[PDB]
Design an enzyme around this catalytic site. Structure first.
Site, PDB file in Angstrom:
ATOM      1  N   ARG A 292      55.131  47.964 -27.492  1.00 13.63           N
ATOM      2  CA  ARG A 292      54.543  48.739 -27.895  1.00 13.63           C
ATOM      3  C   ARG A 292      54.589  49.480 -29.236  1.00 13.63           C
ATOM      4  O   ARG A 292      54.031  49.538 -29.929  1.00 13.63           O
ATOM      5  CB  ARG A 292      53.900  49.869 -26.979  1.00 13.63           C
ATOM      6  CG  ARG A 292      52.337  51.032 -27.126  1.00 13.63           C
ATOM      7  CD  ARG A 292      52.489  51.964 -26.721  1.00 13.63           C
ATOM      8  NE  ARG A 292      51.807  53.259 -26.790  1.00 13.63           N
ATOM      9  CZ  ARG A 292      51.289  53.565 -26.737  1.00 13.63           C
ATOM     10  NH1 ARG A 292      51.862  54.846 -25.842  1.00 13.63           N
ATOM     11  NH2 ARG A 292      50.429  54.857 -26.961  1.00 13.63           N
TER      12      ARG A 292
ATOM     13  N   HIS B   2      52.674  49.076 -33.238  1.00 11.19           N
ATOM     14  CA  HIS B   2      52.176  50.073 -33.386  1.00 11.19           C
ATOM     15  C   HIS B   2      52.661  50.746 -34.452  1.00 11.19           C
ATOM     16  O   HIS B   2      52.062  50.698 -35.687  1.00 11.19           O
ATOM     17  CB  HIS B   2      52.041  51.658 -32.441  1.00 11.19           C
ATOM     18  CG  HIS B   2      50.960  51.676 -31.713  1.00 11.19           C
ATOM     19  ND1 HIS B   2      50.121  52.817 -31.031  1.00 11.19           N
ATOM     20  CD2 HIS B   2      50.448  50.174 -30.919  1.00 11.19           C
ATOM     21  CE1 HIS B   2      49.486  52.553 -30.481  1.00 11.19           C
ATOM     22  NE2 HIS B   2      49.204  50.820 -30.041  1.00 11.19           N
TER      23      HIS B   2
ATOM     24  N   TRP C 107      48.298  47.095 -15.533  1.00 11.87           N
ATOM     25  CA  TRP C 107      47.860  45.065 -15.450  1.00 11.87           C
ATOM     26  C   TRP C 107      47.563  44.912 -14.520  1.00 11.87           C
ATOM     27  O   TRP C 107      46.873  43.882 -13.601  1.00 11.87           O
ATOM     28  CB  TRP C 107      47.738  45.422 -17.153  1.00 11.87           C
ATOM     29  CG  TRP C 107      46.484  46.139 -17.863  1.00 11.87           C
ATOM     30  CD1 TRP C 107      45.358  46.344 -18.063  1.00 11.87           C
ATOM     31  CD2 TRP C 107      46.980  46.581 -18.792  1.00 11.87           C
ATOM     32  NE1 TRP C 107      45.252  47.313 -19.379  1.00 11.87           N
ATOM     33  CE2 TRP C 107      46.732  47.742 -19.592  1.00 11.87           C
ATOM     34  CE3 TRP C 107      48.677  47.327 -19.008  1.00 11.87           C
ATOM     35  CZ2 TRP C 107      47.101  48.169 -20.759  1.00 11.87           C
ATOM     36  CZ3 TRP C 107      49.038  48.333 -19.785  1.00 11.87           C
ATOM     37  CH2 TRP C 107      48.292  48.588 -20.683  1.00 11.87           C
TER      38      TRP C 107
HETATM   39  C1  HEM Z   1      42.897  45.857 -28.352  1.00 13.70           C
HETATM   40  C2  HEM Z   1      44.134  46.751 -28.460  1.00 13.70           C
HETATM   41  C3  HEM Z   1      44.585  47.561 -28.209  1.00 13.70           C
HETATM   42  C4  HEM Z   1      44.720  48.404 -27.809  1.00 13.70           C
HETATM   43  C5  HEM Z   1      43.016  49.417 -27.053  1.00 13.70           C
HETATM   44  C6  HEM Z   1      45.609  48.377 -26.672  1.00 13.70           C
HETATM   45  C7  HEM Z   1      45.596  50.337 -25.461  1.00 13.70           C
HETATM   46  C8  HEM Z   1      46.626  50.075 -24.651  1.00 13.70           C
HETATM   47  C9  HEM Z   1      47.010  51.664 -24.078  1.00 13.70           C
HETATM   48  C10 HEM Z   1      45.680  52.732 -24.108  1.00 13.70           C
HETATM   49  C11 HEM Z   1      47.919  52.217 -23.733  1.00 13.70           C
HETATM   50  C12 HEM Z   1      48.154  53.143 -22.652  1.00 13.70           C
HETATM   51  C13 HEM Z   1      49.053  53.049 -23.227  1.00 13.70           C
HETATM   52  C14 HEM Z   1      50.254  54.930 -22.669  1.00 13.70           C
HETATM   53  O1  HEM Z   1      49.374  55.286 -21.671  1.00 13.70           O
HETATM   54  O2  HEM Z   1      51.472  55.001 -22.071  1.00 13.70           O
HETATM   55  C15 HEM Z   1      49.345  50.368 -24.171  1.00 13.70           C
HETATM   56  C16 HEM Z   1      50.403  49.862 -23.617  1.00 13.70           C
HETATM   57  C17 HEM Z   1      50.548  49.372 -24.355  1.00 13.70           C
HETATM   58  N1  HEM Z   1      50.330  48.026 -25.179  1.00 13.70           N
HETATM   59 FE1  HEM Z   1      48.228  47.905 -25.827  1.00 13.70          FE
HETATM   60  N2  HEM Z   1      46.093  48.076 -27.011  1.00 13.70           N
HETATM   61  C18 HEM Z   1      45.939  47.354 -27.382  1.00 13.70           C
HETATM   62  C19 HEM Z   1      46.473  46.484 -27.929  1.00 13.70           C
HETATM   63  C20 HEM Z   1      47.635  45.344 -27.659  1.00 13.70           C
HETATM   64  C21 HEM Z   1      49.251  44.599 -28.405  1.00 13.70           C
HETATM   65  C22 HEM Z   1      48.390  43.860 -29.633  1.00 13.70           C
HETATM   66  C23 HEM Z   1      50.177  44.980 -27.926  1.00 13.70           C
HETATM   67  C24 HEM Z   1      51.376  43.945 -27.789  1.00 13.70           C
HETATM   68  C25 HEM Z   1      51.444  42.958 -28.651  1.00 13.70           C
HETATM   69  C26 HEM Z   1      50.489  45.532 -26.679  1.00 13.70           C
HETATM   70  C27 HEM Z   1      51.344  45.994 -26.152  1.00 13.70           C
HETATM   71  C28 HEM Z   1      50.868  47.479 -25.232  1.00 13.70           C
HETATM   72  C29 HEM Z   1      52.181  47.819 -24.243  1.00 13.70           C
HETATM   73  C30 HEM Z   1      53.719  46.927 -24.269  1.00 13.70           C
HETATM   74  C31 HEM Z   1      52.157  48.667 -24.050  1.00 13.70           C
HETATM   75  C32 HEM Z   1      52.813  49.714 -22.386  1.00 13.70           C
HETATM   76  C33 HEM Z   1      53.772  50.607 -22.977  1.00 13.70           C
HETATM   77  C34 HEM Z   1      54.389  51.271 -21.526  1.00 13.70           C
HETATM   78  O3  HEM Z   1      54.680  50.654 -20.729  1.00 13.70           O
HETATM   79  O4  HEM Z   1      55.049  52.147 -21.829  1.00 13.70           O
HETATM   80  N3  HEM Z   1      49.079  46.702 -26.980  1.00 13.70           N
HETATM   81  N4  HEM Z   1      48.114  49.774 -24.631  1.00 13.70           N
END
Ligand code: HEM
Ligand SMILES: [Ca+2]
Ligand SMILES: [K+]
Length: 267
Positions: free
Chosen positions: A31, A35, A175
């Site tokens: 992430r 970002h 998820w």
């Molecule tokens: C529509 C696009 C996206 C939205 C709205 C979105 C939204 C989110 C949100 C809300 C989280 C939770 C953050 C937290 O509370 O710690 C998250 C986690 C994450 N997202 Fe996304 N995301 C998107 C796209 C992506 C993309 C493109 C990637 C990677 C290529 C990605 C990878 C991740 C990963 C790995 C986490 C886990 C972080 C953790 O476990 O600490 N996401 N995402």
């Protein structure tokens, strides 16, 4: 092709060690890298992607980057130990190791990224995508980045690993039933469960009817609702190898946006 000036082998190993001592770091490093690339605007050609500009205010304080201090701090220890690597290289390289370590594809690494020197190159707020929104917004964000619909869906499949934390995004939960494994199970989950309203999280999210322990965002389920995005959800749910390959290409592209003079690492 070309040897980097830092010990890549030893570094790869230190990053697997660090992830193994704290498994929930694997998903946050992915992430973090996503970002740092997600500020790009291919039409305006601004936003300093893949430059580790999130080290600086004000980008580090954007709502959408909340909690990313944890993986940055964890990596500081390694920058110290391997000073020749840029932070930007380091951040990208750690995501790739994380993806591999968790069972995902091995993505070819290119090195030579230059760090932003101050926060004047940071892009504006509002470029990170909003989980409460749906397909209009999603396509708008990913168009602005340079991705098509196929690339978009493939990249969001990274939600196969990690979880939402109330303290960070205000959302809650994993998820998939294996938040530490990287495969196509995000698409599988999306398509195989009945997603019902979670009545007890204040920011709107869905939960699986079967167990109620999994979650999807509005931005996730919009991939079902949109007829173009749903084609690709189906493609990846029925073909894990295809998912590995397309994710690999798209993430590599993501982490090479707005870069120049990179060199292919060996292995
Ligand atoms: C529509 C696009 C996206 C939205 C709205 C979105 C939204 C989110 C949100 C809300 C989280 C939770 C953050 C937290 O509370 O710690 C998250 C986690 C994450 N997202 Fe996304 N995301 C998107 C796209 C992506 C993309 C493109 C990637 C990677 C290529 C990605 C990878 C991740 C990963 C790995 C986490 C886990 C972080 C953790 O476990 O600490 N996401 N995402
Ligand atoms: Ca950036
Ligand atoms: K998973």
């Amino acid at each position: 092709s070309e040897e980097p000036p830092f010990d890549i082998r030893a570094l790869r190993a230190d990053i697997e060690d660090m992830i193994s001592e704290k498994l929930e770091l694997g998903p946050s490093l992915i992430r973090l890298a996503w970002h740092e690339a997600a500020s790009y605007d291919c039409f305006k050609k601004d936003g300093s992607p893949n430059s580790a500009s999130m080290r600086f205010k004000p980008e580090c304080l954007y709502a959408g980057n909340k909690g990313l201090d944890i993986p940055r701090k964890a990596l500081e220890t390694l920058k110290k130990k391997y000073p020749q690597i840029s932070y930007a290289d380091l951040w990208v390289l750690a995501a790739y190791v994380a993806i591999e370590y968790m069972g995902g594809p091995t993505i070819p690494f290119c090195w030579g990224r230059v760090d932003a020197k101050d926060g004047s190159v940071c892009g504006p707020d509002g470029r990170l995508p909003d989980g409460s929104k749906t397909q209009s917004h999603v396509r708008e964000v990913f168009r602005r980045l340079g991705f098509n619909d196929q690339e978009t869906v493939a990249l969001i499949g990274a939600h196969t690993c990690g979880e939402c934390h109330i303290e960070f995004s205000g959302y809650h939960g994993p998820w998939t039933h294996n938040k530490n494994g990287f495969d196509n199970s995000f698409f599988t989950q999306l398509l195989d469960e009945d997603w019902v309203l979670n009545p007890k999280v204040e920011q709107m999210q869905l939960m699986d009817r079967a167990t109620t322990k999994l979650m999807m965002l509005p931005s996730d389920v919009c991939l079902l609702l949109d007829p173009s995005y749903r084609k690709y959800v189906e493609l990846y749910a029925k073909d894990n190898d295809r998912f590995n390959k397309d994710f690999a290409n798209a993430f590599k592209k993501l982490t090479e946006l707005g870069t120049r003079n990179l060199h292919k690492a060996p292995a």
